[PDB]
Amino acid sequence: LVHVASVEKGRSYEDFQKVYNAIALKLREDDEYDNYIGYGPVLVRLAWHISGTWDKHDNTGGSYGGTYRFKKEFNDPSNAGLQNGFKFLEPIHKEFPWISSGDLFSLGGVTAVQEMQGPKIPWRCGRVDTPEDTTPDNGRLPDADKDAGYVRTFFQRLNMNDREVVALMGAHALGKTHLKNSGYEGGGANNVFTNEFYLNLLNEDWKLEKNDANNEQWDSKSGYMMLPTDYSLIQDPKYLSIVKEYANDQDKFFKDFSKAFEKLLENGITFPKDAPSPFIFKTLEEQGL
Numbered sequence: 001l002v003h004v005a006s007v008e009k010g011r012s013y014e015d016f017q018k019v020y021n022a023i024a025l026k027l028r029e030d031d032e033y034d035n036y037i038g039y040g041p042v043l044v045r046l047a048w049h050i051s052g053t054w055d056k057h058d059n060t061g062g063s064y065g066g067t068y069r070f071k072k073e074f075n076d077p078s079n080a081g082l083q084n085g086f087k088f089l090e091p092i093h094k095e096f097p098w099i100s101s102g103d104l105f106s107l108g109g110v111t112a113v114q115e116m117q118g119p120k121i122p123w124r125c126g127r128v129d130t131p132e133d134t135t136p137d138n139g140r141l142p143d144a145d146k147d148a149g150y151v152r153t154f155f156q157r158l159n160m161n162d163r164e165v166v167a168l169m170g171a172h173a174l175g176k177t178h179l180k181n182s183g184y185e186g187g188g189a190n191n192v193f194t195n196e197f198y199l200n201l202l203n204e205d206w207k208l209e210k211n212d213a214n215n216e217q218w219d220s221k222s223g224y225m226m227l228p229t230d231y232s233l234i235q236d237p238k239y240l241s242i243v244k245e246y247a248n249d250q251d252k253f254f255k256d257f258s259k260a261f262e263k264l265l266e267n268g269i270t271f272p273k274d275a276p277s278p279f280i281f282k283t284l285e286e287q288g289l
């Protein structure tokens with residue numbers, strides 16, 4: 001199974017920076033969502049869930065086909081809550097109807113990371129909408145109630161190694177869990193991209209508690225929480241070494257996240273040799289907007 005990137009007809013960097021800017025301006029304006037967290041974190045999660053269905057063995061799933069727009073994937077219980085990100089993007093797709101769904105969903109993730117003062121994430125266009133029958137079945141996204149061996153094995157399906165997994169998990173510095181979506185009771189929340197996830201893991205006094213959905217989670221007296229899969233990163237000796245490295249080096253964490261997140265968004269896609277180079281979008285702040 002081969003998915004060849006094909007540039008939206010006649011489009012170039014300027015066209016995509018316009019779409020970036022429309023998303024970024026809406027993120028600034030619609031600031032009330034989720035108790036003033038805004039839509040940044042849910043857009044990062046949406047970009048990851050549309051990519052995280054990929055299977056390296058047969059090249060099914062992944063971001064290329066934009067299949068989240070179809071009922072089966074949209075209603076995956078693992079995707080509960082992402083409807084809010086879809087609704088946010090809807091008026092943008094109406095304004096720029098030439099952009100493919102996979103491009104728009106992945107670009108939403110890149111825009112959110114950058115606009116939340118994260119690293120620059122190079123991004124390539126040319127995902128092509130594929131038909132309803134290409135939608136992957138539910139159950140390809142990970143459970144949260146598991147241990148380090150589960151996390152490591154799960155991510156091998158996405159061709160991610162230990163360092164890539166630890167860097168990607170740093171996105172759990174953003175946003176929060178919601179009992180009604182996932183069965184985990186959210187704690188203190190944030191909408192600025194930092195390496196704080198690793199500092200919190202190492203520095204807080206975590207207590208294993210049961211929440212109102214009868215699931216276990218790790219809570220601290222400061223009011224933060226960790227999923228069992230988050231806490232597994234300090235139970236496994238290989239993961240723990242990398243957690244310490246990112247807690248102590250913000251720049252390294254930014255650089256490794258950027259590479260791993262770009263790879264996640266590109267898995268399954270063949271780029272022709274004459275495809276354009278990846279784009280690096282300017283933030284609103286860099287444009288004086």
Ligand code: HEM
Pocket residue numbers: 041042044045048080081142143144151168169171172174175176177178179181182183184227229261
């Ligand atoms: C073992 C892998 C992972 C598990 C089990 C997991 C699980 C979860 C769960 C249960 C939530 C709460 C959803 C809700 O109740 O609304 C969540 C939130 C989130 N996850 Fe993950 N996650 C994983 C990996 C990742 C990765 C790789 C990223 C991005 C690179 C990511 C980004 C996020 C973000 C941004 C949120 C916040 C969403 C919001 O505030 O609405 N996660 N995760």
Ligand SMILES: c1ccc2[nH]cnc2c1
Pocket residue numbers: 069086087089090091093100101104
């Ligand atoms: C966001 C919202 C609606 C869409 N329909 C097709 N692609 C979309 C992206």
Ligand SMILES: c1ccc2[nH]cnc2c1
Pocket residue numbers: 172173174175176177225226227230
């Ligand atoms: C999702 C969102 C925020 C989090 N903080 C700690 N773990 C999390 C998972």
